Amino acid sequence: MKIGVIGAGTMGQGIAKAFAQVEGNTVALCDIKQEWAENGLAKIKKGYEKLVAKGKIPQEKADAIVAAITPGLKENLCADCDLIVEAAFEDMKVKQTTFGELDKICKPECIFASNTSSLSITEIGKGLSRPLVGMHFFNPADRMKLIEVIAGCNTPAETVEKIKEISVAIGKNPVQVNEAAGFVVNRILIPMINEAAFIKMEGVSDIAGIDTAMKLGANHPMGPLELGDFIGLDICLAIMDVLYHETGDSKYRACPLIRKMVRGGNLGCKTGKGFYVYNADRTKTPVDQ
Amino acid sequence: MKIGVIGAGTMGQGIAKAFAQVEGNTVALCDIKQEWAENGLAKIKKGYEKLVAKGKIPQEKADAIVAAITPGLKENLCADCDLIVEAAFEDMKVKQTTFGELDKICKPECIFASNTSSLSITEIGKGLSRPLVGMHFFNPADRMKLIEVIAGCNTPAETVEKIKEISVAIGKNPVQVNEAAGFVVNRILIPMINEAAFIKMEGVSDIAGIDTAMKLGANHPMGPLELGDFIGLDICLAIMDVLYHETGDSKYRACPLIRKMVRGGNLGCKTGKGFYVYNADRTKTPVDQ
Amino acid sequence: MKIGVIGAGTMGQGIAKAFAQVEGNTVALCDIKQEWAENGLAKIKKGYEKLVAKGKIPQEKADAIVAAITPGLKENLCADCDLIVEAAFEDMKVKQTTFGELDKICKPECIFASNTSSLSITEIGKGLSRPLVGMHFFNPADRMKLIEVIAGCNTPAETVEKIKEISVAIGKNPVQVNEAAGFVVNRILIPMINEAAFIKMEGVSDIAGIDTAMKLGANHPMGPLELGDFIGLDICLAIMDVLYHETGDSKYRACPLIRKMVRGGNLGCKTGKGFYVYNADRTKTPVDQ
Amino acid sequence: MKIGVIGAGTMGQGIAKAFAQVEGNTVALCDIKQEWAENGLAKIKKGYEKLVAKGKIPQEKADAIVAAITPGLKENLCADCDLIVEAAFEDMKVKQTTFGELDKICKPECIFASNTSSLSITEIGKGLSRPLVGMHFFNPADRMKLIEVIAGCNTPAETVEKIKEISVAIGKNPVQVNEAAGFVVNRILIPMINEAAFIKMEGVSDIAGIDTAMKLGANHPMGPLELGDFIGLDICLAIMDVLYHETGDSKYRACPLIRKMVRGGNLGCKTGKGFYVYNADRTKTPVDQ
Amino acid sequence: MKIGVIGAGTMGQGIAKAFAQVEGNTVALCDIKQEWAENGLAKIKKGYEKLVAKGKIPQEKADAIVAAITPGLKENLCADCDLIVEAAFEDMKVKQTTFGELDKICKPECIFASNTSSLSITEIGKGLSRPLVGMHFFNPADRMKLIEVIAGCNTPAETVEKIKEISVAIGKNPVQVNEAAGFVVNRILIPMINEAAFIKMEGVSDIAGIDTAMKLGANHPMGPLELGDFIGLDICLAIMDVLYHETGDSKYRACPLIRKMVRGGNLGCKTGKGFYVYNADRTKTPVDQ
Amino acid sequence: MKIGVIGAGTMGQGIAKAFAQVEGNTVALCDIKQEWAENGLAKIKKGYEKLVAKGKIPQEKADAIVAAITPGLKENLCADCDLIVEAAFEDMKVKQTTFGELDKICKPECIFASNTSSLSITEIGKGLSRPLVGMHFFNPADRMKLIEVIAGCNTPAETVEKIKEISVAIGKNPVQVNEAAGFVVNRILIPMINEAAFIKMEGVSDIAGIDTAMKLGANHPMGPLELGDFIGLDICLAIMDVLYHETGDSKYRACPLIRKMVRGGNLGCKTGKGFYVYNADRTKTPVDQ
């Protein structure tokens, strides 16, 4: 099958990889600009020469993967595609027009899916001719094997089974989700990080104490403060506000301490500082000390 | 050093083991009737009998462990204990009373600690003539490496470090906590579970779906529902209620579904049913199907 | 079938007539003392003698209905009973002890049912040898057709339908409720009254205009304030506190104005005064003027 | 008197009917352009061309009613008007522009009233030369007999009574409301529907079981979910969010299921599906089976 | 007039003084037993000679005041009093019975007033056969000019005016409150101190800087933390928990930092430590340092 | 030192005089127009010329303060300044750009401060080359002695000291605040006013009774309703909404009464009506009567 992947950003690249990894699957990596298409494609090229050179990929397998992936922009490429997985800018009117255009571009049998974490799958596919489903990947999508199959108000049960079967065609475990804010993982995980920021804000414990408590007591792989610096605190803060706005419940109000840090650019690793300082010399120190 | 452990239930066994796995650590495992204490030791001798039969521990240390835990009842035992770790029934006047009795019994230098998870360390030692501090273990205490050190309103810093030093001396990391509901672990962990039951209850995903989504989407060792069954859905409901009463915050309201199930005696593993049925075949079925 | 109705107050009387109006049904009207049983049996006959007047039921049938209901208490009367509908004091460990006594008394096939509106079905049938179900009648039980069948956490499916069958056997429409505070009608009806009381207390409109507006703008049979006086303002207040405590949600916080009135004994109709003064001369005046 | 109604939709139509059914009442229907106004007058004509032919009204009147209604648009007809009843588009600043235009068009002693449900009466007529009062009709305006008179912060008691006076002059009962979100009826009626959605979403019972529980246990003329579809789920959703935003109280938080259904265009009767499917053969099947 | 004051603790002695200060007023200080009723009166004498000793009262007037106050227990002295002011334990069943005993003892025209700030005036006079009204004083009662006349549900307006007249007659300014939790002063003043504890608990600023910011910013006499130490943090916590329970609104949830200090006996000025440690050498240090 | 004040409005002049009152302090008062700037200085002269002829301050000192305030626009004037106090429109991008321009103009050592009460100090300096700090004055700035020093997420401790030191050197008392909504004064003070309006609205007391119960009961200089009119109710409504929005906590929901009143132009003293009508003949009357 042929798969069109809208958006050549970090999530788009990882989704292109997840399909190119298998077999006869072809990936049309479209974006706004062919420059931005091949940009993401050169990024896919770079990594996939590395795990060659570290005895982790043969080469005639690393090459056949970038070979199934053809970049470019849509319109050109998505007419024959079997499935669209859009991974563009988490913006309602973007996704709506993008899907309106592809609605006349793609063949009638193409399945429409979006990777959105924070927008209504149902609202995205309102005035359309074909069902719109949610196919939620987890970065890096080419390694992580969970798929949340988001069902919308009008998404037929068959459109769901098809995605679950495709997911099981590329190596993932699909979990069915009837549309609600934060689905399952975000709705549970992000408020974990929020609670940790409230615990630090109220002088209950320190940054490093909270994280070693959470990983030696719940045997988690990371502390929640660590984890949020790794997700990006602007991601965390945005998820909290979606939950809060979708529910009307103060239970999901964001820690003011997260909204302060994000206002200051202290977003975590990607900005060198959030709850920890990632030193130009590689290691990790809590801003407590 | 000598350690008196009040309560021969599951926690006092685990705590008595964590001490007795080391060196000059003698233990006095006490309960309300000596019979019940001699019971607790019998279950200790029991596993330690298997661990030797699995080559996993020499007998020569496993016997020197049990030989250092002496069963009996306080008055007759904790008189020269250097430290008291109370782990009895989660009731206020029970703990104000046994600590009040222990204030006359034990020598002026013995430290008073409580393993409570749901009561105020500050209120448990209101009448005492010495400080009272929290020493929060996690079952199984002998295997779990975390101890939350809880300073009450009047716990001196010198006592708090004497708990940090004792915890390093038995292989554990002390996190210091200023007394607040849930400390760190439970305040983050049990609202995870509570959100998982809300998700099931609001028809978002299924029990098996939620659990595999949290261990794949976030790499948690267990699913939240699976985890509730294993801590005890009565513990979870209680911890949630303590949070809601201590703070007055609707955020920590407990999912009516967990109360529905605790009222039904469906508390998880220890009652054969919970979010999963623990079928006699030693497998595990989600009660969705 | 033979039915045992526990409690001889307004509801137990009404439930007995609901069953004795039928056919091969006979009722055991029990309470604490036999004087208290046949007391409610006395009211039932006199009510039927009033019906024999009017032209509404012949004295042949009025006698036939009453010859089915036997006064007395359990222990003597409820051993071959097939169904037990309880309607006693809205208090948990009474219903638990009352059902605990009937556990030995009633025969093993006898379904245990409760009419409770505010207690957890699940909790009452906790210790019991046999399941517990909700059979929620609506005053007056002999005329109102609605029955909410409440499933508890452990109510088997077959029990729920043995109760939907019987409800049709006496001319009711069963609606299945999966236990949750206030089930369906109260959880909607009672917060209607409560919001009406806030409208008065926050000065939005007067008492007659709030009631006029709702039966004119919504074609409702009564206005919420009138309805609150008719139900009993102490019933409405207890129900709101149940909704609020079961959910921990301030959405169901009771209007202080209703609590003020219940504290002053102004409970509605049964005390001659609530939101309206019920003049002993038949008429109804709002305490606004 | 002569009344200027602005807006020729469902409300404008019914509002002018209620005025033109009386006596010396002449009405100036207006809208954006007269193609829009003559439009509404024509729908008024058709319904009146059926209420005669069924035998229920004679033509003489059903001719003189439409005779007193003159279609068109403002500026040329609502100068000598006495009472303005705006019913245009539920958006603030156009209402502010609309009223400020008539501020100079109309004669000074002309009363300004608005029919708004979700907008501040006080805010609409801020900078105006003259008071602005609420005159909340209920669809259909020609027969529903309730009218809510909305007092704003600066709405003199005199303007309010001259609105009650006019209201008893056309058969309706006026209820004075002092401004607050949802007045009396929506604030009580729409959270009803909101709670019924929660009862469905939370698995408490099914769609048809909810609606028949509230029409048998409470003698309501329709079920809450029925009524939801009848009102328009988009309208219900909008009111629930005016209450929340105006109060800041999570008590009026919209049920996320209502919102999901609205995002998919499933609004109820006017789209053929909300909680029921409105079969094109005049039946009604709940979307539950 | 003759005044019966029920209770000889801090408040009773304060109300007795505030009456006997006038002239033709005699007070009947009654409490549990006479040496407790005789305890206050000596306490009262102590101050008043100091009041002469520092020529702030002649002895002429400091002895005529102690002369007007006759101790002993009720029943003996209250058969003829014009006004009764209960100042006993803030316990509902005590209040109800002492007033109930008083209902036969006092004469038909004796007014019943209570000084309670935390209990329902409506409920306290529920059974009684004459109006119950609130007369709320502020410690110390003899110098503080404000009285809050609490009208209960069934408290007649005539009873409010005579309470208002008496107040003006003893040199107070009365403010009419229709019963609601915290009346007016506590409802405003105590959430201030609660907010100040949150600021400190959340790291916003230190204990001294908050208190100097509120007196230098709002020109307040004392800082909210200072003031809480003065009132007694056990008192401030009790008002919050009453506000929270009466209203059901988490808006009145008590700072957990206040419950921690109270559980530890750090109540403020009356224990030597609160937000400030009070040095026996007359100064005051924030626990921040 | 030299100080550039940005904004010639009521807050900018106070800040100009507070610095120029001292000595070697010189001041640059800048605005959008220079006819806007020396408008603010000319009023400074007018004010100082009124206190000259009250015999309260001598001319030669009035002259000496005015002679150190040079008006005009930035760009020209603030190039050599050593402190920047921004007091312009409370408008997020206005400041972000105004501060962006200044960052080029001023020397590398000029400290940057904003007198903003409701905006984030961290966001205002999101991408500047230098740190940005809070310097919160109180109208009237030249007379009020409190300054809250506001540290944003990235504000260096030393920068916070330079503001503490400068504050002490111009006579003020600096309270350090780690940026949170409402700082200390407002976050405490404005919810008082807010709660006062909820008492009025819920019919608990009346406007003048509340305002006297606070200044007699708590020995406050003004009542909360009075203070509200004095600050401006639009400001109060605006601070209440920042808190609600910054926390997601309904604790800080604005009273609907105040929203109705601001939506009504009734803002207090500055519109001649709010909770009191500020009559033209100097006196003040509660709108209650």
Author numbering:
A (entry chain C), B (entry chain A), C (entry chain E), D (entry chain F), E (entry chain D), F (entry chain B): 1 to 289
Article, verbatim:
The A2HBD has elevated expression in F. prausnitzii A2-165 and is crucial for the transformation of acetoacetyl-CoA to 3-hydroxybutyryl-CoA in the butyrate cycle. The monomeric structure of A2HBD consists of two domains, N-terminal and C-terminal, with cofactor binding occurring at the N-terminal domain, while the C-terminal domain facilitates dimerization. The A2HBD protein exists as a hexamer in solution.
The apo form of A2HBD belonged to P21 space group with unit cell parameters a = 87.660 Å, b = 126.611 Å, c = 108.071 Å and α = 90 Å, β = 110.208, γ = 90 Å. In the asymmetric unit of crystals, it contains three dimers with three two-fold axes.
